[PDB]
Amino acid sequence: KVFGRCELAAAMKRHGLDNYRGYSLGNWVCAAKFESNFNTQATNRNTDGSTDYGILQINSRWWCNDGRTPGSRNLCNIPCSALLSSDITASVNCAKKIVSDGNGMNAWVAWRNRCKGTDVQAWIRGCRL
Ligand SMILES: [Cl-]
Ligand SMILES: [Cl-]
Ligand SMILES: [Cl-]
Ligand code: NA
DSSP, X not given: XXXXXXXXXXXXXXXXOTTBTTBOHHHHHHHHHHHHTTBTTOEEEOTTSOEEETTTTEXXXXXXXXXXXXXXXXXXXXXXXXXXXXXXXXXXXXXXXXHTSSSGGGGSHHHHHHTTTXXXXXXXXXXXX
16 A cells, blocks of 8 residues: 555554653654655565564564564564555554664664654645644
């Protein structure tokens, strides 16, 4: 599924991401835009052999099991394929674990390099929320 900006914002709000660990909704929408272009089916292979999955490009080295990343953990206890679903519940629940782990949204390289320190409220402007 390729979400619309406001459609994704409202989905993320319904799932409890607005101000989750202090990160306003526009941070999460900005991260999703630059990580996956709002596409739940996005995958990208990393140099170490791991793969990033879904709308928030969650890494198989730590967070999900894809059967082909030796020595990795599965801290969200899910198959990585679950992160590609049109239902973002699995991705949101896993993202809450990631952002709670200490480094906040710096876990998402695109957030650090393209959203941090910007007017992220702009990502939810105009949406009925
Ligand atoms: Cl915001
Ligand atoms: Cl594996
Ligand atoms: Cl933080
Ligand atoms: Na894994």
